């Protein structure tokens, strides 16, 4: 039976491939060739944030476009005021091997975790004024690779045990488990309406998950190696992924196909982070060459570079309003461009 | 009248920055070690004789060491291995000897050594279960490592008294199998410090100390151009 079930799976894969070919009347690059190019983009560093000792693994902007949370390998989270470069909080961690952090959409909570397989949720606004651990969520068997906040009472995490999870923070129990990847899950991205999310994994694949049902809605393939970063398009009907094959790809959730490839002959390094600008016209990606390339998301030409780090760029983000871009790297410096 | 908020913010930095300075003092004076080993490796005997990750602290001659042992992580190492790219050393424990586990250990050492992010990390290598190797040999390697049939003990070998020359040949053959990889790939940026240890041996606690010292010394010596 096992060979016959495998043959059935291959027949379904062939039907999916043929159904996808049937919809490919034209490529994106054959439509946007009549669109004026963005031209040269020259961003400049406005602020540099110093204070971390170890390499920075995670950074996340708050919803007011003014505060940042960053996490280093020392065992610290620092809340920063990007405008005045002043620090607000400096939270010591139970363990130093933290790989991700997230800022709550309300600004009340900070989440983090890493090789301890526990997601720690800190309450930033307490009656004493001191930052305290409000929850430690445990159940994942592998390292915790990404955390995202849906609301004050719900958090979405991913771990190195090929499973994503939806947690109810107040009760502390896991409520939904999302399985189906075969490699470690590396990055999550939430839809603007937080009903769907997309998960990239060390399988050269990404999955579109329905948050409410617990079902995997779509599987996207096309990358040749492990996927390191994923980011939803501002519209919410497409996402961009970056992988270890030095290629970035734009996928469309409505056509269930790869839509565009961003690559260059002189790039042989992986893509640590991916993010979009407010309008969705620019795609920004951090590489292992200690820099960031700004790509024209509709043309696949390079618009510009962000040079100014001396070690691996580890994290990248864009403000909700769009006024600035923040990056962090393994040299323990967070820089803001504008 | 809004200056009262701005003034408050400066006060926060003074409290935070001073605390960060204190933390920096602790951070740089603490030596972090990563502990890896084989499925049958006596990693427990390595910890006892000294969730997803376990932490052990040591103070050896007023020097603070922080050893991290990888807990219940997935067997796929290529992603969390990158995190440990700034530790003082990787301690790799291999038991000598049912698959060819030693070949798996050689393949893992080779992968760790040639990793682009681990090019500056020295490796303290413990070869464990020497008495089981001694008993097995004195009671076969050519069926896994044919070149052992033509291997001779180096003239500068310093075996312990009482060992059967076949046991010394086996130990030095395996050590040389690891050292050939170490020498072939290294470019003076990092070195391997292999040791022959028993399942029960407390002296291992100093072997790490001295090895860490040597690492730092030659690092600085490399920088001053005196090496």
């Amino acid at each position, epitope marked *: 039976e096992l060979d016959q079930l495998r043959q059935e799976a291959e027949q379904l894969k062939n039907q999916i491939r043929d159904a996808r070919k049937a919809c490919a009347d034209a490529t994106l690059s054959q439509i946007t060739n009549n669109i004026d190019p963005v031209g040269r983009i020259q961003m400049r560093t406005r602020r540099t944030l110093r204070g971390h000792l170890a390499k920075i693994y995670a950074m996340h902007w708050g919803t007011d476009s003014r505060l940042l949370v960053s996490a280093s390998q020392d065992g610290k989270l620092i809340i920063w005021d990007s405008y005045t470069t002043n620090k607000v909080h400096a939270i010591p961690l139970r363990s130093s091997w933290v790989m991700t952090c997230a800022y709550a959409p309300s600004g009340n909570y900070v989440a983090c975790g890493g090789l301890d397989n526990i997601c720690s949720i800190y309450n930033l606004k307490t009656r004493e004024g001191n930052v305290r651990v409000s929850r430690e969520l445990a159940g994942h068997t592998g390292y915790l690779s990404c955390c995202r906040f849906l609301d004050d009472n719900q958090i979405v995490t991913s771990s190195g045990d090929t499973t994503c999870a939806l947690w109810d923070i107040e009760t502390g129990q896991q409520t939904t488990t999302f399985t189906g990847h075969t*490699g470690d899950v590396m990055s999550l991205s939430l839809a603007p309406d937080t009903r769907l999310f997309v998960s990239g994994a060390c399988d050269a694949s990404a999955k579109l998950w329905d948050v409410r049902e617990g079902m995997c809605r779509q599987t996207f393939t096309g990358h*040749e190696s492990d996927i390191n970063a994923i980011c939803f398009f501002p519209n919410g009907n497409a996402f961009a992924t970056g992988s270890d094959d030095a290629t970035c790809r734009l996928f469309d959730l409505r056509a269930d196909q790869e839509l565009m490839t961003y690559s260059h002959d002189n790039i042989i390094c992986g893509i640590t982070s991916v993010s979009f600008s407010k309008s969705g016209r620019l795609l920004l990606a951090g590489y292992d060459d200690f820099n960031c390339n700004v790509w024209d998301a509709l043309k696949a030409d390079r618009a510009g570079v962000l040079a100014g780090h001396d070690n691996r760029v580890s994290c990248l983000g864009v403000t909700d309003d769009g006024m600035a871009v923040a990056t962090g790297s393994w040299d323990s410096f967070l820089k803001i461009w504008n | 009248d809004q200056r009262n908020e701005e003034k408050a913010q400066r006060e926060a930095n003074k409290k935070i920055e001073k605390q960060l300075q204190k933390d920096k003092q602790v951070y740089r004076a603490t030596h972090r070690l990563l502990l890896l080993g084989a499925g049958e490796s006596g990693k427990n005997t390595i910890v006892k004789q000294m969730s997803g990750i376990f932490e052990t602290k040591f103070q050896v001659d007023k020097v603070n060491f922080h050893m991290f042992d990888v807990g219940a992580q997935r067997d796929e190492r290529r992603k969390w291995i990158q995190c440990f790219n700034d530790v003082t050393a990787i301690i790799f424990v291999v038991a000598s000897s049912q698959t060819n586990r030693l*070949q*798996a250990a050689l*393949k893992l050492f080779d992968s760790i050594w*040639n990793n682009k992010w681990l090019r500056d990390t020295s490796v303290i290598l413990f070869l464990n279960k020497q008495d089981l190797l001694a008993e097995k040999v004195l009671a076969k390697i050519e069926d*896994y490592f*044919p070149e052992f049939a033509r291997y001779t003990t180096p003239e500068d070998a310093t075996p312990e008294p009482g060992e059967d020359p076949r046991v010394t040949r086996a130990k030095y053959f395996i050590r040389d199998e690891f050292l050939r990889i170490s020498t072939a790939s290294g470019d003076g940026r990092h070195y391997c410090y292999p040791h022959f240890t028993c399942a029960v041996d407390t002296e291992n606690i100093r072997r790490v100390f001295n090895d860490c010292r040597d690492i730092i010394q030659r690092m600085h010596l490399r920088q001053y151009e005196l090496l």
Partner: nanobody
Amino acid sequence: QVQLQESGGGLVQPGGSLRLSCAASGFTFSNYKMNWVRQAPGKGLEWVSDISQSGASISYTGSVKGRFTISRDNAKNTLYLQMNSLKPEDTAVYYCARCPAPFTRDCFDVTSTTYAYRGQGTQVTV
């Protein structure tokens, strides 16, 4: 989507030989190191052979030196294994495994847990 499909298996008497093959798709073949690994009926996966991107450096486990050879053809995307002078100990499921990243020389591919860039394998009974 990337796939590896082995071929050339079968049953032979002790002392015989086989030529195994492996067809690759979905990735640039010439940029990756390729491996052959075996699964014994009662033992965990064991690494067998490793050929570099160019074929300039070929490594074998000691138990297969002088009996097995490997090669690759980057114009056909095919990885081969010549299995000569076989013994009962060589009965196993053979798989072709790709190193996870291009342009590198470090590989972690004999994991018991599902490894993504591995084929289904072919049974070589002797």
